[PDB]
Amino acid sequence: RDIAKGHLKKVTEQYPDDVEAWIELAQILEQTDIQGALSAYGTATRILQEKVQADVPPEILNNVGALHFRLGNLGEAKKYFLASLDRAKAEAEHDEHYYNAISVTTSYNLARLYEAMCEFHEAEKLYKNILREHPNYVDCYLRLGAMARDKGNFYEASDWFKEALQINQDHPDAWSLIGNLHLAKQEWGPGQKKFERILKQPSTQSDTYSMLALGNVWLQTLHQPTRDREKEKRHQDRALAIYKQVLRNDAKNLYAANGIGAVLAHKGYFREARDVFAQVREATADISDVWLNLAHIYVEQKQYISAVQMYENCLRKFYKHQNTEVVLYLARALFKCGKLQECKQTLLKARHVAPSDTVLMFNVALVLQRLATSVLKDEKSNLKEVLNAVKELELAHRYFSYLSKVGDKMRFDLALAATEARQCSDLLSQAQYHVARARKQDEEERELRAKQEQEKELL
Amino acid sequence: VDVTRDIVSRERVWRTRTTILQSTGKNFSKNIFAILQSVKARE
């Protein structure tokens, strides 16, 4: 490709009646910067009009719209695809170049665009118009199940994805979609190894996608209290061998190092985890995974003032507003006045979307007590706050009773509510004591204002 | 049918699954396996 670029730079300057020189320019620049292929198609579109009145073939309009599909010019790529359809339909005598396949690819990108333009009805209808004329096509049959997978992972998505595999079992795309179905419900933790080892035969080897999906389903088995039983240590060493193998054959794969940092953090090296993750961070930081893995170290080292932003930055994506798993990571070691009262606000933002979780209802209580012991022990503080503190404490104690009745827990029984409930049963007596302080302070400010008002009467 | 070989023979796949895994740049494992091996000798 280097020789084609250096040859194209020689025909670009000089003008020996260049007609197809700009086509071969953009045909290399689709992998490199996506603006360069666009600049070549703009001039290649107009250079085909000076020799004769000849319409642009659909093959150039289809590809120029394909570049704009990945960009934010979705409406303009839509006009390119509509015009590519109208032009390829006009090719009634181009039976050798198969105008029909050109309209097929243009309509495929057009339904791919409509799926992305908040319009799945038109994408479904366009993708079914390819199914009705050529059921031996795979991407149009795979992209239909994805649209229904938004409404749920048990509709015609889980059925269309397996029907595509029986017609083409040597399709790594269609078979990798199968393991993605079992990722909704992780009850197939150990049992997914079989179905992930189907296309691990040497004719498909090497496949980095499957080998790393193995390491992911193997890492999910960590975070268990059975590490002293010489069970999770073998799991760390097994996944580390998987990652070392896909490292020796691919040094530039990021995901290999991704899991390596996860295991090294599970070994207790937070100080030496930053280094491993650095290489990953530098390449592309714009992966959902990194904003989290990185964020754990900062919160680990009592650095919330770099941790709180990274959580926010993940949430900048157009997918949600109030996730549970983020905010769980958010409150770790929070003790600060801006880290406690404000932490309540984010916890409430999380419970607003789904209160059925036990841990939000538990944490909201823990924080509440934190704040209350910080006004009702050493304080000797504002008057109004004392009134408010007992209100909070009542709410907390109501929750301690309500929690206890709940069957399922966070994979850890909540039987330990006794010391927190003891720690509000005594703090009610602290509220009954410190409200006397309130009154003492009350009379103090009243006598202060009067002994000041008399000085003003002297003047 | 011929509609399969009519499209799979002219199209261009610039990105696929494995493309997503490697960096766009040049990040070898000399700066990775070095620390990976250094962590094992201290243990």
């Binding site: 093959e59 289809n62 990108n109 790393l212 992911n216 995901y255 770790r332 | -």
Partner: peptide, 25 residues
């Protein structure tokens, strides 16, 4: 107070989905 906030730290690792680039004929 007594102890820190409960949280299940787990260094997760995800995988991306299929790109489905538009076919450049």
């Amino acid at each position: 107070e007594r102890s820190g906030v409960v949280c299940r730290v787990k260094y997760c690792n995800s995988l991306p989905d299929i790109p489905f680039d538009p076919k450049f004929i």
